[PDB]
Subunit: 253 residues, 7 copies
């Protein structure tokens, strides 16, 4: 009867506490810290609260005066719990879908908002990213709405260099072409590049400068080394050819 | 009876696990990575949880003490699940409607917020865009609200060039007209352009400069090459005609 | 009985698939692309899911063990669908109301947020706008909260020109008046203008300049040509009268 | 019986279509455009959908297999409709309350966010504002959260003028006082002003300037003309008295 | 019976229209404008709609075919009305609570976000604030989340003056002290101040300047006059003592 | 019966009005202003509305035609009231939790967003903060999401001083060390400091300067006086040692 | 009967007040302040309100006129309470999940938004962080959405130094290499570093400068000391080698 059902609740409560002891062993893993005492206390309190609620519900059902006040209170508490748990299920679903489309793997370079780093590990609710300063960022999946991946597909560079307006375009463009040529005859750099450079010439005009563009396409994650080498060669050849940097201009009175 | 219904639940649970094995084969595709072990474990856990919930519901219905506590808990969990799944159905509906109006195809150049690139593939929940730096962006449909497409219809250029205030408009405007004339007699460039240039003359006055505007209408995705050629010719002809760039001015004491 | 009702469900399912084939013909229109295969598959899957849900509901109703678990799951799914469809009905209602008040027509120049262009077509959920760069923007109605229309009513110009503080106001104001006078005696420009210019004189003082204002009222969409002509004439007459542009000033030690 | 009720539904459907024809005449007004064909088609489709839903509901009620699937679908659709209609009733209530407190009339100058213009007309959902560039802005009431009105009450000006630090305050303040004095003896300007000027003297110190403040109180919508006249007189009297504008200062080495 | 109840509905509808006529007299007050015709029409339409809904509900209840479609539609409409009325009850509650704590009175100087002005009147939903330019701002209570009041308690000034780095602190600090001394011996200003000045000396170092701080505590709303007088005296005494303003510095080559 | 219950409602209504008279005495306190007449009228109107609603509900229950229209209207009104009261209960809970953790006391210096001041009093819904300009800010608890407290624990200073690149680090660092030494031998300042200074040397390099860092740890709320004294001593010793401030540099042609 | 149940409610109310007295002892702890009188009064008021609500509910259930008005009011109050408690359960769940993944411990350096500091203590709803200025920040868990931890894993430095464009890269790069060499031969600094420096050479070109990059990997929380030492050595060796800082350039007329 009611007493037999009440004993079943107590038996299940002990099993949940025994399951909490199993969770203590799981929590006992060195990876998730060693201060699991607080977490265990919360689980025990929750189990006790659930057992007390079940017992009170049984008593009220056997009372005959309707559980309406207490039932309404429990319903309000459950509604609050459901309202507060939107974000968690949001992270779970978002992460499940992200791994479904092979959006993120471990070790690749990504960009989530204002952060760029390498993925270290993915939990059920968040993803760990290691920044170039050594900081470890924990980003929940629902916080992620748009991200970029640098290992998928191919890589490319687009380089723009500003040249002073007073000079002529033919000499500066030839200097840039020569700088790219010296880069091409280098062996491992040319191994990184895939194909031939794309010279665009003047791509803009300013009040004191004009800009020249040259674009490549390289191996994934190799664009930055090529960019740095190109910058060094461009500086060297601009110095050789006498190309001037943009200079401010003014008049007096 | 209850036992026969319980056996049916177990039979369906095995079928779902067999369906999960079929999903494992689907997940086994090289495109969606190779670490599908985690996804399979989640599906198995979900199937086990569903089977346990069904069995407990049957037992409680056959108990006679009302499923009210457990039923309310299940209802709260379902409410949380429904609340957390708003974004997913939002992406699904938004993508379905976007493909309905032929808003986006594969390979075209688009602009979604601060990102400009070529569409590579569209999933049920997101769209992949390839940037000019080689990064691969995953953008969910609900995150997309307003976007532009450069392949629909036509293309056009509007070019504004700043000339300092001290010179006269007739000489600078004539120099710009001559620069456009040299561009027109070029053959492939004229093939890109559709029609005749639209000279607007002075379109603004600054404290140290005035601006001249000339606009074209070209083939789709061909506006940038025409713009670069026009910039080069404008610089050359401005140098030829002696037109000066804007210069700062000050007085002493 | 139940079997007769089940046969009716199957008959309706085939009719929906036949209706999907009718939608395939509608989707077959060249305007909405040619890759309608994906859309048809989704419709077929939805019809199959609906038929299966109806059959399972009938079986459960004829079972006698209550549909409560499955009914609650279906209710949660429907709640999620309703929650995710807020935006779509929002666009539908907003567009219906916008067309009710004659807010937007096709071909007129509008400004929706940071975008200015001519309306090309309006769907049930969005509106297409053509920018001056040739890009085609798709803007849903709910994303629209405030917009401006340049074809309703009239057009006007308010022109402010900065003159440096050192000169006198009477000479510069007279030069501006003469510049407007030359503009007035032109024939087509005066045809664009409706009425007489409104001279306001000095309307502000800066540390190194003062500003003069003149305003007109012209035909719709004709304000920019008048503004450009006024700017050219103002520059010419300021050069003629010897009016100086604002100049920076400093002192040494 | 059921057939008699079904005939009543058909009779009401025709009346709604006849009411749509009456709405067509209302829509036929030249003010709300002439392309009301699309709106009429939507109304006809909605009436047909409502009639079909009513007929299906009657058939299902007379079937005996419960309307539960279809009733739940209709409930979900109604929930989505109610969720998507929050903004519309928000505009209706906000506008009703705004006209209740006499916040806005037709023809007055207002400022709603970043827009300043004269109210032209108010609908049930929006308000039309005419900008000084001739653009016509449609602003829904719910989008309005805070606005200012320039015709209610009185008007005032607060004028701050920057004077170089190196000069003395007594001479510059006397020059400003004389400039206000000349303004006062003018007749229509003095008619605009209500009372006497309020001289505050130095109200701030900068690294290269100090500022003098004088404030008035004038008729509504007349503050700007008084401000412009005061600016012109202040410039003239500052030139007469030899008061210098703020000047940058530096030292070498 | 049903007819007797229907007659009661009609009798109440006329009473509501008579109550609307009473509201017309209330609306007839000159303060809430004179165009109350539109408001009366809306009230009459609402009363007619309510009467029609009640009659249709009675007819449907006496029909026997369940009001379920129409009842569900009415429930959806009521849900939309409740959803759209969140802001109004929010303003009502916020204003009621604000007047409970004596946060705002009429005539005092407040600062609500980017607006500073004097409270003119408070409605049930908003508050009117008069700006120093004469504009009248209507701010709903829910839009208010944080505001400041200048009449509660006391007033104070904190004055920071920048002196160039090259000079010595003792001379400049003594000059500031003397400037405060001249202010103190003035009688009405000293009546405004409550106590003695608080000299803090150097409170910061810049690349080309250092700043000195002096703070007071005065009567409410009297801080600005004291600040202006202090600024004037500080300028005068800095000129007397030969204290220099911050000056830019550079070097050549 | 119904009449006896109706008399009970009237008796309770009078008691609520008598309770409102008790609230009038409470509102009669000089602290919560003296214009409590408006609040009392609102309470009386609410009591009358509640009594009328109860009477109408009783009449409808005794009518037999279902309260469904009026009951649904009351339910919608209650739903709107509950929706609009989210913020109030949010403030109540947030404040209760804030006082639970001893986050804020009265008189301490706090920083809530862009505001820094001393707490004056805490209500059930908001907290009053006194700014250094004398303004009194009212901040609801829900508006508070993150704040800092300067009285808990200790205080510290981190001082960075910029020295131009041209000079040598050893001389400037020695000058800073000597400046700190003179500060240390002062007696009350050394009483404020707790321990020894932490010299960090160069902590950054700019194009025209390098920065030196020295950090302390002092008593709570005493960091600013120590900072000002350190700034004065640093300026004095930099002047003594001939250390130069950062200076701009350029080249000609 | 009803009286026996009413006595049980009174007995439980006293037990709750006795439990409040136990909470008073808990609140009596010196850590959570000493003004717990206000909190106790709120608990007593809540207990009294709950007891009164239970008694009124029992009386209404024994009345026979339905609790519908009062039950609906209680339901609306509970709905408001549930709506206002979303944030609290959000913090609880977020903190529980954060501690689960070992995201934060006590004493480590973290970065939560614009705040960087050391964790001092974690409550159930918030986390205390000590800033370098001595301020104590209280941050709820729901307010936390993304944070970084500096003690997990390893630490690294990336140093960029700008060199004037006019000089040559080989000399400046050699000077930087020598500066790193002197740093390496230092003993405790080399103990901090883990491995060898990574020289990247030129990594960017500006209009007046080029930048050189060198990166390390050091012990956790030791990156800043290494960075400061590297900056000092780089300045010293740049001075030794005659490397110039970036300099502005202009031309006259």
């Amino acid at each position: 009867a009611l007493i037999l059902f009440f004993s079943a609740v107590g038996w299940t409560v002990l099993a949940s506490l025994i399951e909490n002891r199993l969770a203590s062993d799981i929590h006992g893993r060195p990876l998730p810290s060693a201060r699991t005492r607080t977490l265990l206390t919360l689980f025990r309190n929750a189990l006790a609260v659930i057992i007390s609620t079940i017992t009170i519900m049984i008593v009220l059902s056997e009372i005959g005066v309707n559980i309406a006040p207490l039932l309404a209170g429990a319903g309000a508490l459950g509604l609050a719990i459901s309202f507060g748990s939107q974000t968690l299920v949001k992270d779970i679903i978002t992460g499940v879908f992200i791994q479904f489309e092979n959006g993120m793997n471990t070790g690749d370079l990504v960009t989530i908002g204002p952060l760029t780093g390498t993925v270290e590990r993915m939990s059920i609710r968040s993803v760990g990213v290691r920044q170039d300063t050594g900081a470890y960022h924990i980003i929940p999946w629902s916080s992620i709405t748009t991200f970029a991946n640098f290992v998928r597909g191919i890589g490319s560079v687009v380089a723009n260099y500003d040249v002073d307006r007073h000079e002529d375009a033919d000499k500066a463009n030839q200097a840039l072409k020569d700088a790219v040529a010296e880069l091409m005859e280098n062996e491992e750099i040319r191994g990184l590049i895939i194909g031939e450079p794309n010279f665009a010439g003047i791509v803009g005009l300013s009040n004191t400068a004009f800009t020249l563009r040259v674009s490549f396409t390289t191996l994934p994650l190799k664009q930055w080394t090529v960019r740095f080498a190109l910058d060094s060669q461009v500086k060297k050849h601009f110095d050789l050819a006498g190309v001037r940097a943009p200079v401010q201009t003014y008049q007096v009175l």
